[PDB]
């Protein structure tokens, strides 16, 4: 299975200045739970943003940099390489990867951040005419998680 994982706001903002625009611990927990024991494919900028591979999953970084060789990280240099990765593969970001992969993935696990943030990077437009809502679950709010959010699982029709 090839899936997208993304958090985007009401206007599809995903990032600002190479970081998340929001602080939402529950989204990180969501991502950790979904991808544990599986594979994440991410662009170079997303990797550098996180700073280190995420433990207990295969971390794959897509880059043109032939000098890229980081401990605990597997490198690929082509989109085509993604299709040779075994198991459940999650497209992890960022904008460039999402733009390249949205027409190719089987499904998407989206956290809709129900606010309007300043962004410099976006998830591409998509329509529910193409995507069946497998599930929609409202995120629970508390003092650590104060922005309304909804977890969608969308499957390509
Ligand atoms: N909200 C979310 O769900 C989420 C998740 C992840 C990231 N983000 C955000 O997304 C933003 C980053 O997105 P971005 O588009 O600027 O960067 P990105 O997608 O993370 O990385 C782009 C880089 O990936 C490499 N790349 C992409 N396609 C390639 C290809 N076909 N062949 C070879 N290399 C390829 C290139 O690296 P080289 O230049 O080294 O060749 C390119 O510069 C940040 O703000 C981050 O916080 C948000
Ligand atoms: C510990 C931890 C740190 C993280 N930092 C990020 C960043 N995303 C963008 C810049 S840094 N993220 C990410 C990365 C990619 C993500 C993605 N593709 N979808 C969703 N919904 N959340 C993400 C969150 C982290 C996730 C975890 C579990």
- Distance (Å, whole) CA 90 – CA 139: 21
- Distance (Å, whole) CA 60 – CA 73: 6
Centre of ligand 2 from the C-alpha of residue 28, in Å? 6
Helices (H), the chain: 25-35, 44-50, 95-101
Are the CB atoms for 139 and 14 separated by under 8 Å?
no
* 3-state secondary structure at position 120: coil
| Ligand 1 pocket member 110 (CB < 6 A) | no
In angstroms, this model's resolution equals: 1.7
- Distance (Å, whole) CA 103 – CA 140: 31
| Ligand 1 pocket member 63 (CB < 6 A) | yes
Which atom of ligand 1 is nearest the CA belonging to 6? 3
- Distance (Å, whole) CA 100 – CA 88: 18
* 3-state secondary structure at position 79: helix
- State which CATH number among 3.30.450.40, 3.20.20.140, 2.40.50.140, 3.40.430.10 fits the domain covering 1-157: 3.40.430.10
Are the CB atoms for 107 and 4 separated by under 8 Å?
yes
- Distance (Å, whole) CA 72 – CA 55: 9
Which atom of ligand 2 is nearest the CA belonging to 18? 10
Cα–chain-centroid distance for residue 138? 19
Query: Method used for this model?
Result: X-ray
- Distance (Å, whole) CA 44 – CA 153: 26
Query: Could you tell me the maximum CA-CA distance found in the chain, to the nearest angstrom?
Result: 45
């Amino acid at each position: 299975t090839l899936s997208i994982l993304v958090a985007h706001d009401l206007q599809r903002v995903i990032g600002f200045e190479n970081q998340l625009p929001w602080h939402l611990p529950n989204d990180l927990k969501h991502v950790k739970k979904l991808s544990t024991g599986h594979t994440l494919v991410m662009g170079r900028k997303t990797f550098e943003s996180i700073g280190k591979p995420l433990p207990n999953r295969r971390n794959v970084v897509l880059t043109s940099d032939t000098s890229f060789n980081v401990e605990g990280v597997d490198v690929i240099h082509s989109i085509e390489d993604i299709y040779q990765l075994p198991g459940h593969v999650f497209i992890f970001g960022g904008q460039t990867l999402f733009e390249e992969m949205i027409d190719k993935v089987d499904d998407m696990y989206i956290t809709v951040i129900e606010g309007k943030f300043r962004g410099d990077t976006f998830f591409p437009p998509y329509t529910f005419e193409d995507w069946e809502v497998a599930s929609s679950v409202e995120g629970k709010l508390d003092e650590k998680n104060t922005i309304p959010h909804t977890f969608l699982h969308l499957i390509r029709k």
